[PDB]
Amino acid sequence: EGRLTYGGYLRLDQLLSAQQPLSEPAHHDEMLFIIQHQTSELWLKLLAHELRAAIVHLQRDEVWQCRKVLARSKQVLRQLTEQWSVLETLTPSEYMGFRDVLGPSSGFQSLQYRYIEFLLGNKNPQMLQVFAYDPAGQARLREVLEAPSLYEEFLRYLARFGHAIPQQYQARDWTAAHVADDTLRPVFERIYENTDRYWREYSLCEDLVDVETQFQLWRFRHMRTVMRVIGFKRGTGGSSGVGFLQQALALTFFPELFDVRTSVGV
Amino acid sequence: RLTYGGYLRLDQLLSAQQPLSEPAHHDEMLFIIQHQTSELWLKLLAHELRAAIVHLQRDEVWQCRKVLARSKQVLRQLTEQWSVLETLTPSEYMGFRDVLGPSSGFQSLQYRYIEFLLGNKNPQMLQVFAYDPAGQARLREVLEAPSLYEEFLRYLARFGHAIPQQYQARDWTAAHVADDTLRPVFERIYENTDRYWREYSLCEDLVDVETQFQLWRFRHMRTVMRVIGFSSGVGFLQQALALTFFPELFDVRTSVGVDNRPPQ
Amino acid sequence: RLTYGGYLRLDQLLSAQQPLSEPAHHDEMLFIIQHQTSELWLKLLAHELRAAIVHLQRDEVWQCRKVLARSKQVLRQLTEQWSVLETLTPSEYMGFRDVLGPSSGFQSLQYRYIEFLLGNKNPQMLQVFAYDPAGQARLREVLEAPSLYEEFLRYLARFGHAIPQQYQARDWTAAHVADDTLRPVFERIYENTDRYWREYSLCEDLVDVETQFQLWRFRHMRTVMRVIGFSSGVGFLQQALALTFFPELFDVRTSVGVDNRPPQ
Amino acid sequence: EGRLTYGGYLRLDQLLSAQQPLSEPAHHDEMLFIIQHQTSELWLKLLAHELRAAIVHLQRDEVWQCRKVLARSKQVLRQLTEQWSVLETLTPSEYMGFRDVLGPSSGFQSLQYRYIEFLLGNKNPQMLQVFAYDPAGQARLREVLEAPSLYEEFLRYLARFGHAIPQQYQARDWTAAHVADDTLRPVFERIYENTDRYWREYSLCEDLVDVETQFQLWRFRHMRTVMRVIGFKRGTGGSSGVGFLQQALALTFFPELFDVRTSVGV
């Protein structure tokens, strides 16, 4: 159909022909497994689309626009987090009926997910290997890898307005994951200590805290779902499974924002 | 097949987002993805509802309930996701709505499948799918088969319930009409849950499914209202809220009351 | 004050659940707690909405938005919690509904406060609170004061917007009537968000608040429908869905369209 | 008003006069702080009410009734978990405006919460000390402490139907928290390996997994909220704060149910 019809515009012939279970005979629960991932991948694509715009707004000092885009980003992350409730209706007995059809593949190979991790700041050049089979996508990942993260662009925004931001944030090896910077503590303390004056900065700090918290919630529900489905069995990717996902919850995108809590109003 | 992206056919899935606006409008991606995620969930919902029907045809109560439990969760995601589209403002929509066609989800085959399966049969709807004789035939099969509700009634008939003989054979293509003779049947079930726990649990599962479906319809309407404002249009969506899949289940609420409980 | 239970006054709070059924019916506790949690949330909502009004009176936009953000979250909890009551079946309710009085949340003072604050003023409602002259007077104060919406309009008037002079002084006890002269005002705001971002963001916050409130009304109605089935009754709840707090905000959707964007 | 009026039935004069902020002047955000806890305490009271009934149903082999009560229990836990989203709008700058008015009190002193923990199996006789000031409530906690938990009643249910349940579960020191029992693995493996036959047991196992998962989600959101409000500052109760809440996520009510995942369909 033409791009002006409902199905043609949405390219449903292509979208709705992408569900191909491998189990033989076809296991009833494999459709859920596939759709759970595909809906997530679509939301991740939208999330990346929105986050990229949030970065551009920050670079241009467009605060309200940045916040609006981040508001939608939070709603998308919330859908990604809420949907785990569907997959939790998948029991170990059902999963073991087709887990074998799956190869040594895993979410590790999710290009879109890695894209988000990179955009938020959890850079990992060593992650470019898993996508060696695909140079095209690998290239797009490299771009974000070599560019300032959402968090670093926020720091650059603060720098443009006279905040005491270290000179290194003007230019450095962006491919290296951000490391907790103690010198940023006084910067955020000032913001939280005078919110009427630094309302723009204050609102953005809380938006970032919201984003990270929602992301961690996604990681937690992910881990808990894996736990109830495969328990402590090793993952098809090669990790310890739950153990590895448990360590992921220890990661932090915006450490200084959480650390400042300990000194606010001291 | 062997890799994450290969198994999930992501090259195909992630190349299905093609905005028409040019210069490309930032908010068109949301418009597309909002529909596509919904279509994927609707496909899963049909997959599960078909299984629920099979379980009823096999007198498999707990299995039917488990499948319906997942169905409720899928309907819940479809309902909750409207919150994302609510961030689409009139200012943003007016920037790309002009390049879009004049259709809506009214043209969704997957959605019509759900309506049909639940019992809201409409032979006239087959016309809109004339362009697709394949999907038209696939939809006609559901149209000619008993709905999820009618299969529940047939299940009840197989176990002593006073289900009218008409439910054994009739023109299933016609949408179910409220049957007052079913009132005593549901009253007996709700008035003796200790004995009719299977039937009672299924009745409540159906009420859950319909209620969640109505919530989807309401959130849909409220989202459309805040985007384009106020048959067809939002008026048609308002009328959809007056539709009911399992009327007798809601009607029985007004007459249940016999107390068959033992000494307490 | 010094201890957890003392500070939260739990001895008082947790001794307020007194079922009337005897023998006590297991499901009456839910009925009570469902109402009490809602009343607590409504109290917080009034607390926040009052603050939102103060911020508008002080031209404090970001503060108003932050308070409204919390208000939306409170309304969301009030809406989501209906899922708990949906597990109350007709079979269970018929076991204790007889000992209950003939009233409903229509008699909720806290709820009426919210309706009034949002603009749905009704002097006649003061009568139902005649038994409580104190609460009647506290409610009358909100009745005689500009609503959250009218304070938003007054804020707009202070900054060059073509707000009618009538909004400077009038009988606030009367519910706001749809004003077509406000259409060009909101069109200008939505057609130049780069300049009117403050106004644009507040307009959308109000649409969010009203939409979430309507979702609460809908879930309320659907829950009542599945418990007791189908002016007064569910018919009255159905009519409540036709009420609107900020009509002009929804109406402008049908006429926005001027494109003031720079070259792109 | 009489118990037949709306306000009289719900005892609103008493319920709505229980919000007494201590800050001076009255801090705007203290009302949220109080109401957030009071709504939670009301849901916890309902949860305990429902869980007690679930236990009675299990003792009487009333499976569908038990499941229905657990379904409502899950919905209540979901409300308790979802509401954290309201409290997350409370920033460090707002909280520090009245955190001082609060004494050395903490959720540790929540009798209703401890009641739930005990009912689920996380027994701790040493926790009877914190409620020494209140012998009345302390007594009610002791009852559940000395009685079989929800999980142990499930095991006793399985025992009544011929499942290979250890004799110790017929009578033992219930005040002692349940310890992971390896001998239960074969019992749950059999259930998950033949769900058509053991559908009753299967459904109950999944209900318990649902309950524990939802409870852990509550613990996680609790911890994340504390993290964004007070950061890594020590709690008013006396613990490390986030660190302590982090260890709480390591606790498990029904270990055998999660451990069996590793051997299901081996």
Ligand code: HEM
């Ligand atoms: C049956 C349900 C699921 C199970 C058992 C499961 C299991 C796992 C395991 C064991 C890992 C660790 C790597 C390995 O050794 O394989 C992993 C990683 C990952 N999974 Fe899941 N998964 C499930 C569903 C999902 C869904 C629906 C998504 C959404 C697209 C997803 C996204 C991811 C991602 C993005 C990683 C990489 C994380 C990182 O590098 O931190 N998984 N999964």
Ligand code: HEM
């Ligand atoms: C802001 C975006 C949207 C607008 C303005 C809109 C508008 C409408 C309107 C006016 C109708 C009534 C029938 C007609 O006149 O064509 C309709 C129906 C429908 N729409 Fe929406 N829609 C939007 C987004 C969506 C999304 C994301 C979905 C999910 C796939 C969806 C699904 C449907 C369905 C399934 C019907 C058929 C309902 C029925 O036959 O009762 N729409 N839409």
Ligand code: HEM
């Ligand atoms: C199964 C239990 C419930 C039933 C059968 C029920 C029924 C009704 C009915 C029939 C009305 C219409 C006015 C009237 O005729 O009195 C009403 C109004 C109302 N109810 Fe519900 N209700 C229930 C639970 C609740 C709960 C838990 C709340 C939360 C506090 C609540 C809040 C309200 C409010 C605020 C109104 C006034 C609405 C308005 O004036 O638009 N109800 N209820």
Ligand code: HEM
């Ligand atoms: C401003 C928000 C909050 C903060 C900063 C906070 C902080 C803390 C901290 C630091 C602890 C550890 C013990 C200590 O050293 O004090 C704790 C424990 C606890 N809190 Fe929270 N809390 C908050 C809100 C809530 C709410 C709304 C509830 C719901 C009633 C709650 C329930 C509990 C419970 C039940 C424990 C005991 C847990 C256990 O023994 O595992 N808290 N809280």
Ligand SMILES: N[C@@H](Cc1c[nH]c2ccccc12)C(=O)O
């Ligand atoms: N972060 C929350 C609360 C919030 C709204 N506006 C704010 C401004 C500043 C700080 C926090 C907020 C939200 O985005 O809803």
Ligand SMILES: N[C@@H](Cc1c[nH]c2ccccc12)C(=O)O
């Ligand atoms: N890694 C998962 C399997 C898996 C989860 N999601 C996937 C998506 C595609 C392929 C495999 C997977 C496991 O250990 O069972």
Ligand SMILES: N[C@@H](Cc1c[nH]c2ccccc12)C(=O)O
């Ligand atoms: N029908 C809308 C556009 C639209 C809504 N939903 C759609 C789905 C697909 C394509 C277009 C649409 C219009 O008036 O233009």
Ligand SMILES: N[C@@H](Cc1c[nH]c2ccccc12)C(=O)O
């Ligand atoms: N219908 C609700 C409540 C429920 C659970 N089990 C039931 C059995 C019978 C009737 C209602 C129920 C649910 O599915 O969660």
Ligand SMILES: N[C@@H](Cc1c[nH]c2ccccc12)C(=O)O
């Ligand atoms: N009005 C209902 C009972 C009821 C509903 N909500 C209430 C709140 C409080 C007291 C009673 C009620 C009846 O017909 O009896």
Ligand SMILES: N[C@@H](Cc1c[nH]c2ccccc12)C(=O)O
């Ligand atoms: N109203 C939505 C979306 C939004 C965020 N910021 C905005 C600014 C202007 C208009 C809309 C928005 C929200 O509050 O999340």
Ligand SMILES: N[C@@H](Cc1c[nH]c2ccccc12)C(=O)O
């Ligand atoms: N545990 C999920 C899924 C479920 C429903 N019925 C079941 C029966 C057996 C196992 C799991 C289920 C729920 O309660 O909704």
Ligand SMILES: N[C@@H](Cc1c[nH]c2ccccc12)C(=O)O
């Ligand atoms: N323990 C919390 C204070 C707290 C949270 N909830 C409470 C309820 C009552 C009294 C104190 C509290 C802190 O460290 O800040």
Ligand SMILES: [Mn+2]
């Ligand atoms: Mn059979």
Ligand SMILES: [Mn+2]
């Ligand atoms: Mn009768």
Ligand SMILES: [Mn+2]
């Ligand atoms: Mn000022």
Ligand SMILES: [Mn+2]
């Ligand atoms: Mn005009």
